[PDB]
Design a protein around this ligand. Sequence first.
Ligand SMILES: Cc1ccncc1NC(=O)C[C@H]1C[C@@H]2C[C@@H]2C1
Ligand SMILES: Cc1ccncc1NC(=O)C[C@H]1C[C@@H]2C[C@@H]2C1
Lengths: 304, 304
Amino acid sequence: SGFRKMAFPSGKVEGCMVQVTCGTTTLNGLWLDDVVYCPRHVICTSEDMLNPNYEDLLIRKSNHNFLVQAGNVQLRVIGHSMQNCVLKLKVDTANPKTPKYKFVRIQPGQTFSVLACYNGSPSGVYQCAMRPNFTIKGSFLNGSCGSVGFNIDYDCVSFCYMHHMELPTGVHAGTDLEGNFYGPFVDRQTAQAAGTDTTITVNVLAWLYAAVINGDRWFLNRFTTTLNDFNLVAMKYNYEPLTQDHVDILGPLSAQTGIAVLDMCASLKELLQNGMNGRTILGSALLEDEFTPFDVVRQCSGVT
Amino acid sequence: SGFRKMAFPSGKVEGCMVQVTCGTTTLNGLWLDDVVYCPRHVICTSEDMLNPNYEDLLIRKSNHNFLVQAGNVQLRVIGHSMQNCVLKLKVDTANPKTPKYKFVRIQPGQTFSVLACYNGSPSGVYQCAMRPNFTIKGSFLNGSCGSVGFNIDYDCVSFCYMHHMELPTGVHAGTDLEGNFYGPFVDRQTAQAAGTDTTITVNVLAWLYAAVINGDRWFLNRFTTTLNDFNLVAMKYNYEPLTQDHVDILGPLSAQTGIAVLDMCASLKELLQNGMNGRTILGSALLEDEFTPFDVVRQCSGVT
Ligand SMILES: Cc1ccncc1NC(=O)C[C@H]1C[C@@H]2C[C@@H]2C1
Ligand SMILES: Cc1ccncc1NC(=O)C[C@H]1C[C@@H]2C[C@@H]2C1
């Protein structure tokens, strides 16, 4: 009973957080095996950040300029390389707390947990979604760079995000663990505007299924619709187009509740056209889009 | 930038979760030092649960009837006692992962993180608040009993909640770590109705301060009010009465933003009387009450 914005247990990721200092800049690093991963902008000063040439800036840096601290102990840096927008610092010791892990580049609409850190130390954990404009609506202050986004499948941590930037609008930008930014963002102190933040339609539908499962049924109507009819409405309300792929992954939720996917789309259509009328769904007065169909199944079944 | 419903890092609590089985019932236990804490209803069968006499039921249980498993290894039970509604199972081994900890009984309106578990294993972490009717709006399925609520002050874990029940309305009831239930609930399969779930006024004000800090200012008005005037409005909208104590703890937020507490109360008053008019505050279309003034300060400053 009850449905909550739930994050993965953060322990496996806490054991990987370290503090990386280069010159006067301190941010977070992710220590897995004998490698520490961090944003390459750790090598920048405030003047460098305007238009930095990272290859040129990295020439003046040696292994001994990167100070890596795990807890209160210093790690010895025996190598350093730049991969896209991340620096990989080879240390002489494998992290004894290295969990089983993968590096995955997620698609927009996918959710993940963020372990927000400062000075290599965790401050908190929350659940995020890669927005369709490739930004994330996080909670990050100066010093949080290098904090990571992840998912967990039983014992394997899939790292998907590393925090790098705060856009002038207060939304966040970052890379996968190979250093490639999500979206068109560049690691530079230049105004970069975000594109349209559309609603993740499949996630809203998954959350309407979670609501039916947990007792909130007022929004269920006597109507049905078609993919094409629904999508005309979704385009009007800046909702992502729904595909047969999205319908397919909603199948187990559709089967559990006995509510066909297209019927739920018609409920969503009326919710878009008429609003909530001062009512709530799962304690929210708006349509929640940061639960994937997989998150709903996991939470509603108790996967550990 | 950005404000999120953030939970504490869960690692220190994950290292304490174990599985407790008694007869055919399996739930979660909290292993701290050489003691495992769990709900006493682990000794009940489905027939016992209607009107259980726990003292009588515990007479038929010996140390060897309580199966405690931490990971894949079995803990030896050398003692067992009942304290209010929790069982304390003395084991022969201190938990090597025991963090620094305290047991605290929280007041309504206070927030905490829940590490939801099944079979001694973590499934996820979310942020909760002890409602003014002493229930929590969690996300718990059968097998989640024994999951705990906690806060963290640097390295010390303050355990405040242990999950015991799901009321017939889908809201949750439980105890502090001394086994005393929050509210009037009893650990029995009897319909127990909850009282009025009032809104935590001080928390809503703290969240309006978080919104001003993060850029959402549309709700700021040209008005002020008094404690007595505000409270007449708060009573009408089932909001908890605001006291000078609540005003005092909002002081650092009032000082940071330069917005007097009574001015913010007048903004809240107009929000209650006029609604949001289809607008949002920190991505919410309703007034969020599960951030304490302390949570806002912590998040907005980056406390780790
Ligand atoms: C100030 C802050 C708050 C939260 N998250 C991140 C930041 N930092 C930045 O955005 C700095 C950017 C500019 C320079 C190339 C690097 C990234
Ligand atoms: C079924 C479920 C789901 C989520 N959280 C808890 C539960 N379990 C119960 O409520 C059983 C109660 C009755 C018996 C005396 C014990 C507590």
